[PDB]
Design a protein around this ligand. Structure first.
Ligand SMILES: O=C(N[C@H](Cc1c[nH]c2ccccc12)C(=O)Nc1ccncc1)c1ccc(N2CCN(c3ccc(F)c(F)c3)CC2)cc1F
Ligand SMILES: O=C(N[C@H](Cc1c[nH]c2ccccc12)C(=O)Nc1ccncc1)c1ccc(N2CCN(c3ccc(F)c(F)c3)CC2)cc1F
Ligand SMILES: O=C(N[C@H](Cc1c[nH]c2ccccc12)C(=O)Nc1ccncc1)c1ccc(N2CCN(c3ccc(F)c(F)c3)CC2)cc1F
Ligand code: HEM
Ligand code: HEM
Ligand code: HEM
Lengths: 443, 443, 443
């Protein structure tokens, strides 16, 4: 029964704050911060109070609590049709933890034996089919997209599986599923209690994939180290296995999670590096990768490439593909001198934290050699219990593609300045039609 | 199980693409076309995938299929309260076909015996009451509106009927009904499953009209070639008549369909013709109509006026009053090298087809003497099974009003360039407040 | 069965007219007026016809009818969770009248014995804690906010009550409640039939306040002229008392009603008065208040300050904090030469009436010495049966704060022109971040 955060007073147009959030979210949240003179503050959306933790020193309040107190279940009901009932966020809180952890186990550094070669293998194959000429023009964003999905499938899926479901069909399933979503319904929980037609189409689409996975398992058992096999070998505390229904859901979530995020990180990283005023940084990277043979390996990429890590990390720092991390308060919580009541939605913003000037002096500058001036202010992958569990995989895959690509080609951007981000989409990246790039096959 | 069309990635603001569609729909769909490099493509609206057939060579894919495969029922649930249950699109697919065809029968060239005189009669009466002076100022769009409703009622309704329900009351019923609609709910099928208050008001409004029609029928049977009479004489395959409930619905649909479309076509046609840089075309039309007596007839208007037809047709070509034709895919369908999955909404756009530069070189120019450079690219009235069944009537009425009006008055537009279209409305026409025109009674 | 008002034709974007109403509502409604050439007219919002009475000569049509004919119940279902079921607008029409009247009784001039001293007392205390220096910078809008809530609580609540619930907790309850609202759902009655989570949080919040009130009553009865006591002494026609549930609801409605309105009136009044080109008016006010002692009283403020009244009234005239008064037509009603059908929403607009140039010549000028050129055109507090019942209290409190403040400090605005209104909010006032003001403690 203490002090509530200050409240931006309710506005009339229905969900109108989302339109501002989709146009310039940074200025928007910065105004909120200035006007009410508080890093912690509250806006109302569709009659849903949303409290934004906008002070980087307070990050621990947000990321520390357990799922029974700050819960993501209620904020991600949109996903239940694409992932499936009883799966991840639509799963009881214990079963949910074990599930997320099983997937995390499958993506530990300890599991990446063949990955870097499988990945180099795919990138080379891709560059050979589409970058055939001595020079040519491409959309970098679309091509990274292709590479990420193709590389992920080589790593994670066995030969038998890929033969039944290639990456291009997989990419279509993921796209169809995305397109069926209503992101703004995060603020319309009443909508999601109603029958949606496209909820049912997507469950049929996911039952087709489940069928495939089942046929494969039966085949394997006639004649189990890929993701599918790993997950089927998993055991809960009570000594039971995951259903194939749960496994199919986890695999979809895994690929869905990485489709846009990894893609966008690669694109930005490349875009900054090929930019003239960053020549200096491009040379620094050439030195680092020239120092290696051609066929790379785990150690090279993960252990022996600290400057690549910086470039990638700084790209996420400048343009976090996920603008906002959110939770449903199931029991009230302190934050600075305030309390945040149960039922509120509580939110923390990588975009905002990453442009705080105490935290990142001259935030608009991309500088791979900078460091946070506030500890924990970088939250591109979050922090705490809920920190990204595909971070190490995401980074392997991005670092490898960088290293393979820049070794074999020069890249020229076909406009003066680096692309504007497009804040209209769920996952934020560079504007598609500003991503035109001319490759040049190297001597 | 083939290739899906490329998908514009989902955006956050709720139904935000509609706001762009209501501001500059042409640029919007053109961007979609450029960015994804495909004439066929997909956007998501309110979680509803909408596939746009944007390549004029593919028109046959869209317009060929039968109602059991590409259905308009689900896209036009908005209309069920104004037309009535069991009527047109709210009717089982067989009964629906017969109904639409009965109405089509009543509007065949074979049925237009007295129409041109009845129409001249009304236009003269109108010009005498409101264009009394030697010169004066008017809103062309409002006055065409009046003329279209008055002329339609003379043609279609008998004396007894019109005495009980004049055109000005009829125009009010149509307006009240329109105003009760939620066009954007095409993308909110969940909304239309909920009780709407204004659904019930409109059914009471339509029961008042039904009562009137019934009283008239009883009167006629004491003392049947108008639309009301024709339709009551109709027989289904199974040998039964339409209910009066179905007939009342058909009559409303008929008048509703033409209220704005015909009006807008007339207005544009006049606006282009009275424009100075089109003098040449105005003279061409004067020659064509001077060549006739004063009391016109069917042959004169429909058979002996090919240049009027061109001017009208080109006006629809430049500014199709219906931007978009849509269907619900009930079973998947090929389109070019793509397949379009069941549950998608499939759409084809006269606005887009009519501004394709292969199809209509310099699309922005109004030129009555042009021709399509792609066969079937003109779709102002659609094509195939679902082609407009009031096309011949619409055109009779527009051609006649042109011929009667320009014979008796000169017209001057009170601003430099022709009016901008206003894309905000369901039916698109010229901006109301740019439609100021000065008439001058001729010598 | 007469003439309907003309209808602005339906637009596509969902509730898109609200976005225009939240950007420039005056231009919006003025366009509607010009374009259709009628003071009375109709727009459609979310499929809900809304008829605007925009001609000041017709005000009596709107404000005369009884609650059984023009009802506010259906337009204010948004408030039912914050005020409570069975209370005010969620109450049967007889019980509703008696309730509103009981509250009106408690705010008659006859009840304001200690009020002016209690109020001076609070304003002095406030100026001493926050305006401590010889000079300093403040947000006038936030500080009036504080003063209004603190002064209201001194007047209306006894010592025992205030000790259990101070104004700062009270202000938080009011804010939390506001933030839970969906103003645009005035046009989505279907939404309010669905379970909203934040409906339930707010009822728990109001049950906590009810508990407090009950504990206090029990305490008082051990050891009844404040608002709480007055209302508990009230008797309905049938000889029963209000429940404590109804009393708690009335008290919340009372404080909610005044939080923003009174605040905004004070702010504007001060902002205009401290503006240089209004020096003349500032001096006129100084003369009026210098003519009094320091400890003021009822007569001084209400009877002996006619120029303060003018300044306040003109501020409401220029910027009515409530843009629009609305009602649900339960039975059709004449308005000028039109009829307005049952089910329509009928609306009248202080913003519009207050900027009609026949009514207020040069409406954009703030002039405390003007007069209406149309009788009844000023409707800042409405008119007729539903006229504001906190008007006399609102004005006491504003006049007093003006008189106490300007006596003790000079005020300087920190930008050239007076703040723009911000039309985005439910209650409209000056833009927060343009309200920076420098006080100077007087000699
Ligand atoms: O891309 C999104 N989600 C998808 C689907 C998803 C959700 N949760 C997951 C957990 C694990 C795996 C996948 C998911 C996703 O891939 N998220 C994701 C999460 C973690 N790592 C990688 C990717 C996504 C992207 C944006 C988004 N919002 C748009 C902005 N917004 C918002 C929030 C607060 C505000 F104050 C505001 F004005 C707008 C609502 C949240 C909501 C979303 F669900
Ligand atoms: O005027 C409209 N309909 C009305 C009512 C109606 C519907 N179907 C009928 C069949 C027969 C008779 C009447 C009707 C109408 O009069 N339509 C019409 C149809 C055929 N001939 C003449 C007039 C209308 C006008 C526009 C509209 N849309 C607005 C734009 N929109 C849209 C569509 C696709 C997109 F990708 C997008 F971004 C927006 C949704 C469709 C929807 C509509 F129903
Ligand atoms: O502040 C508002 N209400 C609140 C809550 C409330 C409602 N009724 C009451 C009766 C007694 C006490 C409180 C209330 C309020 O405090 N109103 C109020 C009423 C009377 N005296 C002082 C204050 C409020 C403020 C604005 C509003 N609208 C936004 C603009 N709008 C609108 C209306 C017509 C249009 F044509 C349009 F385009 C938009 C919908 C009405 C609706 C609202 F309820
Ligand atoms: C550049 C790529 C990626 C970025 C930027 C990113 C970002 C994030 C962020 C910000 C969070 C929220 C963490 C928190 O709440 O503390 C997160 C969580 C998560 N990410 Fe990612 N992510 C990426 C890739 C992936 C990949 C490839 C996967 C593959 C499975 C994945 C799965 C997850 C999961 C499962 C969670 C949260 C689960 C939980 O609630 O514990 N992410 N990610
Ligand atoms: C200039 C006037 C008009 C224009 C521009 C217009 C345009 C169109 C268009 C584009 C279609 C879609 C056809 C398709 O899907 O292939 C259509 C269908 C239709 N129009 Fe019109 N129309 C006009 C006037 C009228 C009139 C006066 C009526 C009177 C009844 C009418 C009734 C219909 C009907 C019933 C359909 C489609 C029925 C079906 O699904 O088969 N229209 N019209
Ligand atoms: C400057 C301050 C205020 C302004 C500008 C304002 C304005 C208005 C307006 C425009 C109306 C509509 C009246 C009608 O429909 O004829 C009204 C009604 C009302 N106001 Fe206020 N008001 C103010 C302060 C207050 C206060 C302090 C209260 C405290 C209780 C209050 C309670 C009400 C109530 C209960 C109604 C209408 C009840 C009914 O339907 O009869 N208002 N006010």
């Amino acid at each position: 029964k203490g002090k509530l955060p200050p409240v931006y007073p309710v506005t009339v147009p229905f969900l109108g704050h989302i339109v501002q959030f989709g146009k310039n979210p940074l200025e928007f949240m910065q105004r909120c911060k200035r006007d009410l003179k508080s890093g912690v503050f509250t806006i109302s959306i569709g009659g849903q109070r949303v409290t934004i933790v906008g002070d980087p020193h307070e990050h621990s309040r947000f990321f520390s609590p357990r799922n029974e107190i700050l819960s993501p279940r209620e904020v991600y009901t949109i996903m239940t049709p694409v992932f499936g009932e009883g799966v991840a966020y639509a799963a009881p809180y214990p079963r949910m933890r074990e599930q997320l952890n099983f997937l995390a186990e499958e993506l530990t550094i300890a599991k990446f034996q063949n990955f870097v070669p499988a990945i180099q293998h795919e990138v080379r194959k891709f560059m050979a089919e589409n970058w055939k000429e001595d020079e040519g023009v491409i959309n970098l964003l679309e091509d990274c997209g292709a590479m990420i999905i193709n590389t992920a499938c080589q790593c994670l899926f066995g030969e038998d599986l890929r033969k039944r479901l290639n990456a291009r069909h997989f990419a279509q399933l993921l796209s169809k599923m995305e397109s069926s979503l209503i992101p703004a319904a995060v603020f319309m929980p009443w909508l999601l209690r109603l029958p949606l037609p496209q909820s049912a189409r997507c469950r049929e689409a996911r039952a087709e994939l489940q069928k495939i996975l089942g046929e494969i398992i039966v085949a394997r058992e006639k004649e189990t180290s890929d993701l599918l096999g790993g997950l089927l070998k998993a055991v809960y505390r009570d000594g039971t296995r995951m259903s194939l229904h749960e496994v199919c859901g986890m695999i979809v979530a895994a690929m869905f999670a990485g489709q846009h995020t990894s893609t966008i990180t690669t694109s930005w990283s490349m875009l900054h590096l090929m930019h003239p005023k960053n020549k200096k940084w491009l040379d620094k990277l050439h030195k680092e990768i020239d120092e290696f043979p051609a066929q790379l390996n785990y150690d090279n990429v993960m252990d022996e490439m600290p400057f690549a890590e910086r470039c990638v990390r700084e790209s996420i720092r400048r343009d976090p593909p996920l603008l906002m991390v959110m939770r449903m308060v199931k029991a009230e919580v302190k934050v600075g001198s305030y309390v945040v009541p149960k039922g509120d939605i509580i939110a923390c913003s990588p975009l905002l934290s990453h442009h705080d000037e105490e935290a990142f002096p001259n935030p608009r500058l991309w500088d791979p050699e900078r460091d946070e001036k506030v500890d924990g202010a970088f939250i591109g992958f979050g922090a705490g219990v809920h920190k990204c569990i595909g971070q190490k995989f995401a980074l392997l895959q991005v670092k490898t593609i960088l290293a393979t690509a820049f070794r074999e080609y020069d890249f020229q951007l076909l406009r003066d300045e680096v692309p504007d981000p497009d804040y209209h989409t769920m996952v934020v990246g560079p504007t598609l039609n500003q991503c035109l790039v001319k490759y040049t096959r190297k001597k």
